[PDB]
Design an enzyme around this catalytic site. Structure first.
Site, PDB file in Angstrom:
ATOM      1  CG  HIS A 231      -1.114   3.413   1.976  1.00  0.00           C
ATOM      2  ND1 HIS A 231      -0.176   3.515   2.990  1.00  0.00           N
ATOM      3  CD2 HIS A 231      -1.250   2.083   1.718  1.00  0.00           C
ATOM      4  CE1 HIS A 231       0.225   2.297   3.340  1.00  0.00           C
ATOM      5  NE2 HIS A 231      -0.400   1.411   2.576  1.00  0.00           N
ATOM      6  CD  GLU A 235       2.952  -1.735  -2.482  1.00  0.00           C
ATOM      7  OE1 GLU A 235       3.348  -2.812  -3.016  1.00  0.00           O
ATOM      8  OE2 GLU A 235       3.564  -1.155  -1.497  1.00  0.00           O
ATOM      9  CE  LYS A 238       6.625   0.045  -2.675  1.00  0.00           C
ATOM     10  NZ  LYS A 238       6.836   1.408  -2.028  1.00  0.00           N
ATOM     11  CG  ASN A 239       4.222  -2.850  -6.704  1.00  0.00           C
ATOM     12  OD1 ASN A 239       5.170  -2.925  -5.936  1.00  0.00           O
ATOM     13  ND2 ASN A 239       2.990  -3.090  -6.322  1.00  0.00           N
TER      14      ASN A 239
END
Ligand SMILES: O=C(O)CCCC[C@@H](S)CCS
Ligand SMILES: O=C(O)CCCC[C@@H](S)CCS
Ligand SMILES: [K+]
Ligand SMILES: [K+]
Lengths: 374, 97, 374, 97
Positions: A231, A235, A238-239
């Site tokens: 998780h 994240e 993705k950024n």
């Protein structure tokens, strides 16, 4: 709410990865687990509920908040039924297991339902100074406790749910005693890459280096819950992919890779994700973790950092405006040092909800400072 | 006459201050006032200053509204009352020992 | 202390680099400066003094603290003599200038005298939890105000002291309007290198990259006070050189360089110093800035970070245990945004000194957690 | 007899707690006690727990010293008195409406 007052006055029992592991590997005694959980879950819910009643009435009022609240109440009452049901009956053992499933399900939508709540509240009462940091304080605590309920329930159901053919049989409940970090890194990357490619029609390459100071050539492994780590990594990737791809979509340059260093020392496992996506000015950083300043629900960075801090880790960002950003996940190297970090309701907590705005400690300039030339 | 009450005057909050803008009230009519609570932001030419409640009470009325610029020193800014019963009496605009 | 109460109740006037610059370049009117300073310096001293009286009596008692206190009192009283001496007499102007010199001198030893104080106190009353963070709060504030007195005095004396042949004539008081960052970087490095070579008989090489997103090829320049920046860079280089040299003194490897990236964006000037000195576990980082956990007075990192935060900048460290450490100085890119950040004595400040220990907000494990195998 | 006084008993601070170690006093004899102040750290098998003052007063005497392990539930731990005049009376070891 007399039962809630009483249970909210109880202190949580934080557990370590070591304990979870030692329990599942060596022991794995359902009685012990049930006796622990029948008390611990209501304690945890009551501690949270007490804090939800301290929210400003304007937020408390939102139907979403009310819904969350009655879901918790409903879980608390269902759990409280076991306080005097003996473990010696294996029947009770079975029903309790069903109740756990029932409340995991009921709680499936808590995160976004709460999110809806605070959005409702902001877009209807506006963004204010002190109240914001208050909601911040609350959400960190609320989402952490929520991660922890889920952890405890998952351990019990995975261990005693009697799953005939379990997905990951070397795992102990949800804990991988030999979690290979680079593998989770690669997996998280591939799944960000897929979403990034879907929308932008292109994505950066991953590069991964390791340095195991413990033992230099040997793949880096940790005792951990893979999907937490997953998780977090997801994240950040993705950024980094979005920043990179946005910066180079109008350039002739060719896209820089997104790099990962994984290091393991006497006490830290560190994972640094670096991109050349152009960076972020310092002033905007602290806000990246503030729930209500938030293509591709923006609670991703704050929640990820809650996963890291949950076992005494942390998640930090450092940028150079004009070039790029580093994001670092710190985990404890030793399971024996990876205790749950749980929000405890007591007077200290109460004080945060009753803090009235105060004068700034430090100076603030005028917004029209005297013109020193004239 | 009116119930026992205190008038909050705008001090010079800095040695050269002769006036300030009342940029923001941080208390509501009706609200309890403890010594040292933040009362308002006062803006000058030099700084933005958190003005503190000097005496405990209840906010009775705001004599100067948010946004009023250049308020001179001494200007009364609001009224403070000892007891909350007495706030009502003031929506109409020395036993205070 | 009636005059101290009154002045401590006054709010500081924070100034910006722009204002200092605009004042010295375009205006440079001694009257204006004197009128400002005769009021501002006592305000600042009184705000600090009030906080020194709130220290625990066990610290207040230390002769060093008492000495600092009487030095401040003595400065405050000397400054207060000008409240009713008119600027129209140029005589008064001259004596005030002498008084400024007199108090800069008197305050020459404040930093280490205070340091002596808290050392005296620790090595005689022990290191405690809440008190420590209290002293921390105090020293940050005290040393910042001290940096700011010195800034104000230096501006006045450099501008009106009538120095016939001034060292840096393009400078405006102590402010360089075209401070070239890499030059300060190189200078700070060379002077750390000299001390490092003196003791270790070897030192790493410096490597410097720049990225000016403002205008890519053009050397990076800032409006700033060079010796502040110097001070910060020097402390970081000293640490990086010591870490590197200590790690490789028993290795066949050959010493890695200490690298510097300097970047300039729409709002941040960032300077990242990177070394491969083996890093520091996360838990030890926050303590690097805690005055009383502190070969080659260990207040260097906390003071440096006070210089950075003083004009709305910041100083941050991020390590990977097992490999190395990054230290980043952030400065504002725009002089118009570089306001003094000054400690204001008010009720908020008072509250920090009167904070009685409170229950932890978050859970803490037992130091002997139940053995989950048994 | 003795002046009006309250006895602080060790509660079960967690649902399974049957005893705890008094790991640290966070208040001194003589010190004022406001509701919610931290009183002591209690250590169990499960956690280290900040035990809070439940009622306001003044600490009169410590009946259990730092370090005492395995203190059972109900054990009196200290004495709290309404007024500081009365602390003296207790170095010797119901109008409390
Ligand atoms: O209490 C204490 C030890 C608790 C051990 C059992 C835990 S690990 C149950 C798994 S949810
Ligand atoms: O007051 C206000 C403006 C002050 C301008 C003069 C300052 S910059 C004196 C230099 S120390
Ligand atoms: K509690
Ligand atoms: K002040």
């Amino acid at each position: 709410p007399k039962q809630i007052e009483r249970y909210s006055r109880f202190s949580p029992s934080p557990l370590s990865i070591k304990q979870f592991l030692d329990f599942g590997r060596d022991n794995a005694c359902e009685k012990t687990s049930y006796m622990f959980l029948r008390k611990e879950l209501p304690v945890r819910l009551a501690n949270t509920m007490r804090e939800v009643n301290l929210l400003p009435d304007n937020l408390l009022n939102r139907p979403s908040v009310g819904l969350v609240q009655s879901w918790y109440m409903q879980s608390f009452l269902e759990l409280l039924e076991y306080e005097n049901k003996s473990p010696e009956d294996p029947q009770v053992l079975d029903n309790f297991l069903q109740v756990l499933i029932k409340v995991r399900n009921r709680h499936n939508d808590v995160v976004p339902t709460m999110a809806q709540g605070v959005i409702e509240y902001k877009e209807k009462f506006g963004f204010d100074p002190f109240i914001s940091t208050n909601i911040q304080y609350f959400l960190d605590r609320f989402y952490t406790n929520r991660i922890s309920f889920r952890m405890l329930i998952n351990q019990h159901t995975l261990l005693f749910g009697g799953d005939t053919n379990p997905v990951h049989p070397k795992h102990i409940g949800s804990i991988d005693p030999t979690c290979n970090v680079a593998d989770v890194v690669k997996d998280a990357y591939e799944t960000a890459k897929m979403l990034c490619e879907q929308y932008y029609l292109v994505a950066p390459e991953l590069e991964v280096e390791e340095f195991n100071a413990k033992a230099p050539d040997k793949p880096i492994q940790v005792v951990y819950v893979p999907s937490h780590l997953f998780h977090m990594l997801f994240e950040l990737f993705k950024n980094s992919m979005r920043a990179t791809v946005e910066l180079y979509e109008d350039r002739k340059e060719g896209y820089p890779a997104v790099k990962t260093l994984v290091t393991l020392g006497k006490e830290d496992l560190s994972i640094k994700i670096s991109d050349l996506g152009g960076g972020v000015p310092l002033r905007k950083i602290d806000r990246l973790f503030n729930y209500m300043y938030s293509p591709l629900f923006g609670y991703g960075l704050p929640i990820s950092r809650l996963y890291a801090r949950y076992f005494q880790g942390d998640l930090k960002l450092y940028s150079m405006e004009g070039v790029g950003t580093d994001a670092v996940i710190y985990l404890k190297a030793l399971s024996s040092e990876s205790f749950e970090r749980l929000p405890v309701f007591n007077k200290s907590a109460w004080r945060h909800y009753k803090t009235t705005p105060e004068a700034d400690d430090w100076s603030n300039p005028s917004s029209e400072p005297r013109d020193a030339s004239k | 006459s009116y119930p026992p009450h205190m008038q909050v005057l705008l001090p010079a909050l800095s040695p050269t201050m002769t006036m300030g803008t009342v940029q923001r009230w941080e208390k509501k009519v009706g609200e309890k006032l403890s010594e040292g609570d933040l009362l308002a932001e006062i803006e000058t030419d030099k700084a933005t200053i958190g003005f503190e409640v000097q005496e405990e009470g209840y906010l009775a009325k705001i004599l100067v509204p948010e946004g009023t610029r250049d308020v001179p020193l001494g200007t009364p800014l609001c009224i403070i009352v000892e007891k909350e019963a007495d706030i009502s009496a003031f929506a109409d605009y020395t036993d205070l020992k």
